[PDB]
Design a protein around this ligand. Sequence first.
Ligand SMILES: Nc1ncnc2c1ncn2[C@@H]1O[C@H](C[C@@H](N)CC[C@H](N)C(=O)O)[C@@H](O)[C@H]1O
Ligand SMILES: Nc1ncnc2c1ncn2[C@@H]1O[C@H](C[C@@H](N)CC[C@H](N)C(=O)O)[C@@H](O)[C@H]1O
Lengths: 353, 361
Amino acid sequence: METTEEFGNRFVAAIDSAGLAILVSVGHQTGLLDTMAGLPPATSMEIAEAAGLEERYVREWLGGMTTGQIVEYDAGSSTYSLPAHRAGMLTRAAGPDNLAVIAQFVSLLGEVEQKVIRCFREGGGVPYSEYPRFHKLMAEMSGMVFDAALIDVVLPLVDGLPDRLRSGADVADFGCGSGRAVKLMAQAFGASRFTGIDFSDEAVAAGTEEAARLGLANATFERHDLAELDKVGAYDVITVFDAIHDQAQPARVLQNIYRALRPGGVLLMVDIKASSQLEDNVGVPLSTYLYTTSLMHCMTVSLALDGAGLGTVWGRQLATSMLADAGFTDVTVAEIESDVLNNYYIARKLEHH
Amino acid sequence: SSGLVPRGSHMETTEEFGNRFVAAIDSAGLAILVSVGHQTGLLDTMAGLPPATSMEIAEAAGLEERYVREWLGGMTTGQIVEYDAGSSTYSLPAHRAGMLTRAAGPDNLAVIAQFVSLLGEVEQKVIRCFREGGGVPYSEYPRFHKLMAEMSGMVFDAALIDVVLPLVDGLPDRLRSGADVADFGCGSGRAVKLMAQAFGASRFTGIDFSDEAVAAGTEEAARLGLANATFERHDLAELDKVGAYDVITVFDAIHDQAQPARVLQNIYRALRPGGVLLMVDIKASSQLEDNVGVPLSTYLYTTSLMHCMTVSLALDGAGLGTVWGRQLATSMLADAGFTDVTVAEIESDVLNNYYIARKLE
Ligand SMILES: Nc1ncnc2c1ncn2[C@@H]1O[C@H](C[C@@H](N)CC[C@H](N)C(=O)O)[C@@H](O)[C@H]1O
Ligand SMILES: Nc1ncnc2c1ncn2[C@@H]1O[C@H](C[C@@H](N)CC[C@H](N)C(=O)O)[C@@H](O)[C@H]1O
């Protein structure tokens, strides 16, 4: 059993780690981690000169980074270094493997703590519009992942899908945001016809503009509320990348996806890998982060519209049964070894007319 | 590490760092959940319940069940709350409730957990200062200052009268007989209230640069009938006090001054010959290498960067920061004219050194 002293030490260490996460976030947004990755052991003043930043701020940052045992400090020379084995997963050189990106979510969630606490008392939720910086960062992260992996890694999970897209299909991306997924697919698959759907006017406008700029005649964008969608047998392929669990009306959205698919069509839904049973998530890395992100964003945004409030950790078992309730009788869950965060749900609609 | 060379310590691998950093992200989330549990009274509620459902916990706390459920999820994966899948019941083990609830007094670690969101709220402002210099003004931190008073208040209620004041040989006797006492950088006036209640024969003045702290203290005095407690608004860097006080106390105010050396000079001047300064400030070394590995060090450098240092730099100040340290504190006491200085420590407050500085008679 854990003692009072052991727990006290463990929680104090958690306090220090929360602080360290904020320092890493600052080091990412300032460019200090990138700067340090390109330098030999250097003084605070040297690092600040190289970074283009105020030395007094750099100095205090380095101090916490050193007590956190990320940055290494030699008292003899007053020099600091970022060892290469840490630098690799904390810098922009790593693209979407840059773990420092995730650290930014600590402040983003902290910014809404007081609003979220109020909802414990008064109900409702914090509206979607309160989180613009959070949404911008999420779109940037998904963008980088799509650039790295959508065409060559993700779509080939679905047996026969690349050939289907090469031959030419009608494809829709539901909750398309920026339109990065639509743009990449429209470039890779000239014979296919792609529609991004989103309820954000700004998203739709942006996608349309980006298509026009690239001369992508096969990429179009439409504003719809996915819960009110009207489309019957329009698409061979529907993709949904993290756009179900935040929904006000997830069951209706899923039913509308089923209805929008042609007989013989396929849904690729990408969403968060977790169990619907709490006990299974204990001890899995990032579980606490996922429940916290849920409480403070994904769940509360849905509850702000009197929605379902399924949350980020809605989990595989519930996702699978909700796909069944939507009409899908053929559902497979794929995983990629290097992706611990997402499940890839492949739901096929029967060919019967 | 090839396996071919003896090394003084474990060389951490890319993988192992990955796992450590991910666990830090989880720990940050857990801190936020504990902060939320403190502010909602959920930790307190659970501490006087047997194992219970999400619905039962919500009912007992008077809160929305859907929020409590998601909270309980994260508290369980963070291994604070325990979940029994057989009965769908949650419980807060007593050994943990003993340091996460108001009833634990000065051992309630849920209080410091509130810092994460508070520093999170200013992160973007602080990042701007890395590029543009200056700092984030003190007025950007209204809630963070309530945290500060909650934290200091735990130590004051537990230790001020019976442990702290007795650290100065003969001070309690002097106070019982009657002395003139000032608390510089007083805040809400918790310490002044406790002293004036304990020592009816002594006169106590709280001084702070906030008019509503001053009027808070002043109201609370008339409301409690403490005629021997008063409060005055001044900036500590510009005072006309000369031989006004037998005793001056300063609790965690020196290191965030714009002009700390000037403030210490003013304290020296304000003391009568043979008087005493009790300066309580953060326990740490002025040498970075000494702080590596000490619990709460990263927390201290982080709060410094994002509050204590930046508020001083906002005023074109010294920016000594939270971790200014024992060596610099002692030399700055020397510079200000204090030739007799001892550093004490107490069990009820791991975060602070108690500097006792005497002015020659
Ligand atoms: N009810 C809705 N109807 C249409 N779009 C919605 C609805 N609810 C949320 N959204 C959009 O769904 C997207 C949710 C995003 N998290 C997914 C964005 C995108 N697929 C990505 O991977 O970056 C946002 O662009 C929202 O504007
Ligand atoms: N230059 C100044 N003049 C007057 N007060 C100041 C000055 N600089 C900082 N402060 C005050 O210093 C106090 C610093 C607090 N950390 C301590 C409050 C209180 N002594 C406590 O232990 O809770 C705040 O109440 C500020 O209002």
